[PDB]
Structure formats: structure tokens, C-alpha cells
Nucleic acid binder design. Structure first.
Lengths: 214, 154, 181, 127, 81
RNA sequence: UGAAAUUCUUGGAUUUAUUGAAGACUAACUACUGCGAAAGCAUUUGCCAAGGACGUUUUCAUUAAUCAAGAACGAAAGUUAGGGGAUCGAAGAUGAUCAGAUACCGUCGUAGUCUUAACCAUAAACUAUGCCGACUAGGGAUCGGGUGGUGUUUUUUUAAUGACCCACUCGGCACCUUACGAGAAAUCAAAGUCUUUGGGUUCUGGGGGGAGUAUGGUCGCAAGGCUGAAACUUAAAGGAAUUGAC
């Protein structure tokens, strides 16, 4: 009988302090009546955004940052880091047919007591003076490279905290460590961190979110 | 349901002269040990005298409803013979234990105990009792169980 | 009032791209009035429209369809007809979407769709008024919606093992019942 | 600048869904179907009916006033074809033609890592 | 290849053939007199040593077995036979 | 869906988002390849126990090759008894319909599909090519190992790793020419070294049906497997290549 857009309500989300352009997107919460239920609806919001659109780089740089929304303050919605992803067409452009896929994985705790899981990928390149129209690495090299990447990721994420992981994660720090230490086994290319997956969170914290806002 | 229409037909008529498929007529007048023999022959020779006359492929049969109808429940006869003649190549003990026959006949047997008030024990059949083993035992408590559907008579 | 889309280029298609680029970009720049750039490093075609150009937002979409269909392996002139005609679309399917095939079954299926000297395939394109790219496991159909549906019927006929003669029969049947109306 | 939305285009072999949502997958804003537009049972998933449904979506978004959309075109996925059909193509042509702001075109098709048994049998499914 | 000599092959072409597949078969290996500086002592080592030939007095591995030939230790004098 | 009808939906289906449970698979990478006696084998990591090739100025000194008897393993489907049961799905239960566009099809779905303990022993189980051994043309790619290079690059100061390049050598899976030669031909580096007919050895066939049928034996719970006829009947049945006339 009545249109919902009569009673529909408009809010505004804001990204955490680790990134540049905190003003990204707004929200349509259809009721302002139950603000306990409205706050609970805002606690379960998760926005996935571009890296480029959040960091102002014009090149649509193929990444995706998942941000879970937690807190409410005067139409302005406080957010928390939730994950990392690529876009699909990037990965389908990456995976090619005469090189060798190498994926590594690690289960993770971070110093903010976050249970996490990290997926790294790395391909194999061919050298300057090739004649073979393909570059396959022996499987011993693949085990060695998976071991090296697993240990590098493990120490690199057990050292840092969550926002420190994000701050390492923006300027491509970790893949250059892989580029350095993994060069001595087999020459690789397209080394990236494909996905980042939160698994478990600590007891519900608020002040860390306000630190991550300012 | 072709023959079965003029078996349960109320006020049973005098005779029945009709022509059907010759293979279906072989399903009618089959003896209990054939691949031709199935549920239908036991039903008809339970409730209707049948004779093949003048094969026309097709064939004509004459049916006579036994007007003092034999008091055998055709519903339970239907269900029992249907289950045992769907799986004619399967052993009789394994066929009751499918998954859903262990549910459908379970609900039918507890509906059969609605006017009996028999205490369904916690032992009920996965180890030793009413769902798994008692149905195996009732088969061994009658003329069935290791005999097959094309070897037991009515 | 600019609007910018980017599309990736595979190196399989990049050599016909860098060969026929001199015919690709001026009809988008002049005949369709679109701003066209190329990052050959990232292999990215960048179609942006400006307030200078004619405000035709559908022309940007048809130019994206142009670059996409050429990226999918289709010819120049067919994609120019896509710039002209609107009712032409693209189907894209896999072999394993219809029937699971393995090894030389896949190769023989592709050969039966193509035929010797393409004579099975080309006779499709004349009689379906469509164009087809047979990729590795991908099929790509370009034409009218009824026409790409009929081409889908033909290729699903070919993929399930039916002989090409029955395909010629159904093909001339559909062509006779379509050209008459 | 503009108010950003989330457009989601599902492409079944019989149907085309256009689905405008707010940020974070909040609530449905504009949502019609080729089925509810064109009454011809042949024309339930035509590109024509897809363009009509997409212009209905554009009209309802301009009724709300939300202009920008991040569009996520989507095939059937699962085990059926993983490329979105010409229904979604003509829907994109219509949403460009209707003058809405387009933030980003992405093709999110659910791809299984390793599929189960399809409903085609050993023979093949259709035709 | 119609008329050639197989009694007297050219020594370069005869040098490249497989060990078993020469005119008269015979090994392609040799021996070494090695000296570690920490003893100034001749140890005789086969070129394809399958075990770690350690020096007489000091516990210094003079060569390690790796595939075909033994890898000599760093800083070791040697001479053939 | 060529076309259409059953099912569900105002208590909200479908779709969207956040989750959770279950079981099955191991895509793209994936060939111009690898392993295994074959059937067969593609996520990580570990444990166990094997194996090929390579290298060897190590050891034994004919210990070998092929194999009726006998023995292990053997895809899929199928049998019995537990567990599991998400997908799909022989049967079944069903809505059908519209053309002679063929049959229709569509939705649910027991068995099974997945494991454990056993049974069975069949495939276009094909590479339609037994195994061991020698000889006879080239060519360029790869896979595993090895030997050289005052080669190259990553420079860590030089090196040494690795990774490529060049040259050689074994041992593979494949390719591409030819014809010396073979064949009826397609084709074959073996299907060659065969009337100028002999390296060793196992198995099989003798025009087509009747017929892998009958009977007997044997193996199996069963389904079946192995072994396996005759009477009678008949001038062809075939294999490869070639032309153009509805």
C-alpha cells in the first residue's frame, strides 16, 4: 500500500585511516524506526572496493578490499578491514598456457590475535636468451619455492599487526621479498598475493576501530 | 489396471470376453516360474478364473470374477507383491532394506501398530530389531525370505 | 563529461591488432567520434568519450562491442557491421557445457564442427547470416538473436555426434523456412 | 559526484535479471524482469525485453535519483554456461543508452574449482 | 660414408663417443693426487668418488659425491693420476 | 522447451547479502609432456616401502630368453553384509502434448554413484600391431641423467648456486620427410633386412551363416565367465582404392 521509499533512510559509510579516500559510498537503510535493529544492520555491512578507487590511482588496479562496517556515529559509519581479493579477469589474464602455476598457502595468526589465511601465487618466467617456447620448473623447485614463500609470509605476518599488514600490503612489499629470496631457486614473475581471508576475530573491540579511523 | 478394473468391479458381471496384447495375455496365464510370471497372474488366479481363447499380435481372454470373493486383502497383496516383483533379480532380504522402504514400510508398520499399541523399543532396527531384523525374521516366519517371488505361490 | 572503459588484449590477438590498428581506430575516432587510446604495455584499449564528441552513450557501448568482438577473433568488417547494426549480438559457449569430451573426442568434435577446409563451418555462416569464432574450447557466435539461436542449434547438433549430412539437411530446412518469411 | 549503486545482471537461458542494490548489498532498489515486461512466451528473454526491463530499471533509479552503478554481469555459472548471454549484453546497451552513470563494468560469474555431475547425463543435455 | 676407416678413427670423433661404444671400450675417468694445505700430504682420489674421501689426519672432506664427478673442497691442490 | 502444460509464489518464490552443515570433485595451469606391467594416475604437507634412467678403474661370473601347468593384479557395471547419502540418476511415480521437425519431453526421484569387509573377471581391456636380440637413412624439437664452455645473466668483491645458450653422450614419449625396401592399398624406420624364402620362442586362423548356439566339464550366492560342436544351408561375404551419372 505505502511506498517503502517514504520511510526509507539514508546513511553514509567511511573507510578507515590506512587508506587515502575515506569518503567512499553511502547507504540506504530502509527504516529509521528501530535504531537498535538499524545499528545491527550496519554492523553486518561489508563493502568490497577497488584499490584504485580507494587510493586515487587512475589505473583500475585489479584488486578488491573487503571492509566490514561496525560502528555508527551521526549518519557516519565506521568500518574495519575485512579482506583482500583480486578481480576475476585479472587472474584469467594472468594464468597462461606455457608457464607453470605455483600457489602457496599459509594459516596465520596476527599480533592483534586474528586468525587469518593467506594465498600467494607466483608463476614462472623465461629468461632473456631462451630458445624453448615454454618454461617448466622441476617439481623439487616447486616444493622449494612453496616452502620459501610459506616461511616468508609466516614471519612477515606474525611480526606485524592487522593494520601493519595492510600497510605492508599496499606498496607491494612482500612480493619483492619473494622476488629476492625466491630468485635463488628459480626465476619467477607475476608474484602477487591473491586472496586474504579472515577466519576468526578476538573479543569485540571498539577503541581500535577509533584508532583505525583517525 | 487393465485386468484389475474387472476384478474389484462391484456387482460382478457374468463373464468377460476381451482382446488385448498377446504378450500381456502371456502375462495373464503365466505359471509361477516364468519371466512372464509377475504380480498380475497371482492376482488374477487369486480373484478371477482366466482362460485364453482364440488368439487373434493380440489374444482374447475370458475372465470370471469369483462371486464368493476370497477374503485376502488386495491392498496388502498389491503392496507386498509390488515390492517383491519390482526386484525380482534381487534377493528378498536385501530388497526390504533399501533406505526409503525402511522408512515407508516403517511408517506403514507403525500405522499397522496404531490399533495394537506395541511399544517400539529403542533397539528398533539398526542393530537387532523391528526395522532391520524383524522384517527379515517375518520373511523366515512365512513361506518366503530365501525363496523368490517367482517361486512362491499365493 | 568523459566516460572511460578499458579492455585487456591477449597476445594471441595482439598481432592482428597491431597489424590492422590503422583501420581499427579512425572509424571509432572519426566515423563514430570516440576517443581511442592504447597502452601496448598493459595491453589495454582505452575507449573514452569527451564533451567534444557527439553525445551518443550507446556509441561507446557499440565501440566496446567492436573492440571486444575483434578481441574475440572476429573479423574487421563484421565488427564494423556491429558498429552499424544494433541487433547483432555474441553467444559464447564451451564444449563441456553441452557434452563432456576428453582427448581426441574433443579434437574430432572440433574437426566435425569445422569440416575439411572449413566447408562445414563456412556453409553455416552463409546460411545462418552469422559469423563464428571457433576458439580452443570456446565458440563465439555473432549475428541476430534468432540467427545466433539457429547457429546454437546447429553447433549443438554438431557437438553431440550427429553427422554433417543431417546438419546440411536441417541447415537448408532452416534457411528455406527463414528466407521465405 | 553521483550516487553509486550495485547493478547485478543474471542471465539464464530463459530469463534476464537486472538488480539494482545499494552499497554493501543493502536493499533492492530497482528490480524487474523480462518475464514481467513482455507477455509473449517466445519473448521472455529476448534482447528486446531485456532492453525494456533495463530501461524500466533506469526509470525507477531516476525515480529514486540514484545515477551511478557498479555493474556486475553474471552468467548462470555452476555447471551451465559461464558467459553471460546477449540478454545481459542488450541490458548493458540499454543502461548505456538510458544515460545512467556507469562506474565499473565487471563480469562476476561463479566458476567452480572442480564441478560435480551435471544434469546432462553421459549423452549431452539439450537438443 | 661409403668407404671410410674404422680401424683408425679420427681421435676427435673417437673422443666424443660413449664409453662403452668406442672401437675398443675403456674408461673416461682418471685419478688424482690431491693436497690439502692443512697437512701438505698426497691423498689419491678417484675422479668419481662415491664416498666422502676425508684426509688422513684432519677431518676435512676432500671431495663430495654429486652425480658423476666428486666436488673437490675449496682450496685444494690437485694433479692427475 | 521447435513450441507449450505439472510443480512454488502475498505466510514473499526467484534473485541479493551475511553466515553454517554435508558429501563429492580436484578446473583453468594441462602439451609441443611425465609416471605405471597393464587397468590407471593432476591441491598442500608429512610418513612408509618401492622403481626406472644416468654415473661408476665396485661385486658375482652364465646365473639367461620365451613360456602349456600354476599364480598376482585387473576400468565400468553387477551380488552380500555395515557406514554414508550433497550432486546426478538404470527402474518407478508422474504432467504431458504437436507436429507427422524426429521422437516427444518436463518434474520428482529407490537402486546405484562414495567408502569398509568381501564376490566377479568382462571392454573398440586398440597402439585394432606378442616378447627377447642384431643391422639398415636423415632432421629438428622436447623429458630424465651426465661431461665440457677463459658461454651468458642474476653480482655477494670474486666465486659457488641455480636458470638459459652452445657442443657431445645415454635412456625415453612423440613428430616430419623420403624409399633403398615392403605392401593389395591406405600406409610402414618397422608392417624393412621374405621365392635370393631359416636369430630364439609363446599364442591364434583356414569362405559365409547356422553359432560363441546345443551338450558336457569347471569356476561363481547370483548375474555370468572359461572350454565349446554337429546336423542343416549357401556363391559369395569381404579389405583397400577409384570415378561421376536421381
Amino acid at each position: 500500500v505505502v511506498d517503502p521509499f517514504t520511510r526509507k533512510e539514508w546513511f553514509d559509510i567511511k573507510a578507515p585511516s590506512t587508506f587515502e579516500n575515506r569518503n567512499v559510498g553511502k547507504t540506504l537503510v530502509n527504516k529509521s524506526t528501530g535504531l537498535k535493529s538499524a545499528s545491527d544492520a550496519l554492523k553486518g555491512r561489508v563493502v568490497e572496493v577497488c584499490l584504485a578507487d580507494l587510493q586515487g590511482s587512475e589505473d583500475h588496479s585489479f584488486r578488491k578490499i573487503k571492509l566490514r562496517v561496525d560502528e555508527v556515529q551521526g549518519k557516519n559509519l565506521l568500518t574495519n578491514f575485512h579482506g583482500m581479493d583480486f578481480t576475476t579477469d585479472k587472474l584469467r589474464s594472468m594464468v597462461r598456457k606455457w608457464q607453470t602455476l605455483i600457489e602457496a598457502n599459509v594459516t596465520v595468526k596476527t599480533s592483534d590475535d586474528y586468525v587469518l589465511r593467506i594465498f600467494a601465487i607466483a608463476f614462472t618466467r623465461k629468461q632473456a636468451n631462451q630458445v624453448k617456447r615454454h618454461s617448466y620448473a622441476q617439481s623439487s623447485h616447486i616444493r622449494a619455492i612453496r616452502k620459501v614463500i610459506s616461511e616468508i609470509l609466516t614471519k612477515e605476518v606474525q611480526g606485524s599487526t592487522l593494520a601493519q599488514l595492510t600497510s605492508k600490503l599496499i606498496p607491494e612489499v612482500i612480493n619483492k621479498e619473494i622476488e629476492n629470496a625466491t630468485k635463488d631457486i628459480f626465476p619467477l614473475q607475476n608474484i602477487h598475493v591473491r586472496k586474504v581471508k579472515l577466519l576468526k576475530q578476538p573479543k569485540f573491540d571498539v577503541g581500535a576501530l577509533m584508532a583505525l579511523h583517525g | 489396471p487393465l485386468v484389475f478394473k474387472l476384478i474389484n468391479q462391484p456387482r460382478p458381471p457374468r463373464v468377460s470376453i476381451l482382446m488385448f496384447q498377446r504378450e500381456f495375455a502371456l502375462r495373464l496365464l503365466a505359471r509361477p516360474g516364468d519371466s512372464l510370471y509377475c504380480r498380475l497372474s497371482a492376482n488374477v488366479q487369486m480373484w478371477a478364473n482366466v482362460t485364453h481363447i482364440m488368439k487373434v499380435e493380440s489374444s482374447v481372454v475370458r475372465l470370471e470374477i469369483k462371486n464368493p470373493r476370497p477374503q485376502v486383502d488386495y491392498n496388502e497383496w498389491d503392496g507386498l507383491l509390488r515390492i517383491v516383483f519390482v526386484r525380482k533379480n534381487r534377493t528378498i532380504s536385501a530388497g526390504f532394506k533399501s533406505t526409503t522402504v525402511m522408512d515407508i514400510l516403517e511408517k506403514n508398520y507403525k500405522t499397522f501398530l496404531a490399533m495394537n499399541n506395541e511399544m517400539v523399543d529403542d533397539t528398533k532396527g539398526s542393530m537387532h530389531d523391528v526395522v532391520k531384523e524383524k522384517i527379515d525374521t517375518v520373511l523366515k516366519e512365512t513361506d518366503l525370505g530365501d525363496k523368490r517371488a517367482g517361486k512362491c505361490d499365493q | 563529461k568523459f566516460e572511460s572503459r578499458k579492455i585487456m588484449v591477449p597476445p594471441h590477438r595482439m598481432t592482428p591488432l597491431r597489424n590492422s590498428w590503422t583501420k581499427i581506430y579512425p572509424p571509432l575516432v572519426e566515423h563514430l567520434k570516440l576517443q581511442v587510446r592504447m597502452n601496448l604495455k598493459t595491453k589495454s584499449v582505452e575507449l573514452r568519450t569527451n564533451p567534444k564528441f557527439t553525445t551518443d552513450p550507446g556509441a561507446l557501448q557499440k565501440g566496446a562491442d567492436f573492440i571486444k568482438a575483434f578481441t574475440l577473433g572476429f573479423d574487421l568488417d563484421d565488427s564494423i557491421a556491429l558498429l552499424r547494426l544494433d541487433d547483432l549480438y555474441i553467444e559464447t559457449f564451451e564444449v563441456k557445457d553441452v557434452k563432456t569430451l576428453t582427448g581426441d573426442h574433443l579434437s574430432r568434435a572440433i574437426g566435425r564442427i569445422a569440416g575439411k577446409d572449413g566447408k562445414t563451418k563456412f556453409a553455416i555462416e552463409n546460411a545462418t547470416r552469422t559469423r563464428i569464432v571457433l576458439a580452443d574450447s570456446k565458440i563465439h557466435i555473432l549475428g541476430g538473436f534468432t540467427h545466433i539461436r539457429m547457429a546454437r542449434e546447429s553447433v549443438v547438433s554438431l557437438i553431440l555426434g550427429s553427422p554433417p549430412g543431417k546438419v546440411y539437411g536441417n541447415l537448408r530446412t532452416v534457411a528455406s523456412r527463414l528466407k521465405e518469411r | 559526484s553521483q550516487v553509486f549503486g550495485v547493478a547485478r545482471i543474471y542471465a539464464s537461458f530463459n530469463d534476464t535479471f537486472v538488480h539494482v542494490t545499494d552499497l554493501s548489498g543493502k536493499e533492492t532498489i530497482a528490480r524487474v524482469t523480462g518475464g514481467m515486461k513482455v507477455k509473449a512466451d517466445r519473448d521472455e528473454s529476448s534482447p528486446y525485453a531485456a532492453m525494456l526491463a533495463a530501461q524500466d530499471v533506469a526509470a525507477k533509479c531516476k525515480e529514486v535519483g540514484i545515477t551511478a552503478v557498479h555493474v556486475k554481469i553474471r552468467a548462470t555459472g555452476g555447471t551451465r554456461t559461464k558467459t553471460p548471454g546477449p540478454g545481459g549484453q542488450a541490458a548493458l546497451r540499454a543502461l548505456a543508452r538510458s544515460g545512467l552513470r556507469i562506474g565499473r563494468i565487471e563480469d562476476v560469474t561463479p566458476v567452480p574449482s572442480d564441478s560435480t555431475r551435471k544434469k546432462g547425463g553421459r549423452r549431452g543435455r539439450r537438443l | 660414408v661409403l668407404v671410410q676407416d674404422l680401424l683408425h678413427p679420427t681421435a676427435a670423433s673417437e673422443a666424443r663417443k660413449h664409453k662403452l661404444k668406442t672401437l675398443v671400450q675403456g674408461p673416461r675417468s682418471y685419478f688424482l693426487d690431491v693436497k690439502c694445505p692443512g697437512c701438505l700430504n698426497i691423498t689419491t682420489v678417484f675422479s668419481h668418488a662415491q664416498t666422502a674421501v676425508t684426509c688422513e689426519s684432519c677431518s676435512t672432506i676432500l671431495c663430495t659425491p654429486t652425480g658423476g664427478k666428486a666436488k673437490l673442497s675449496e682450496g685444494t691442490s690437485f694433479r692427475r693420476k
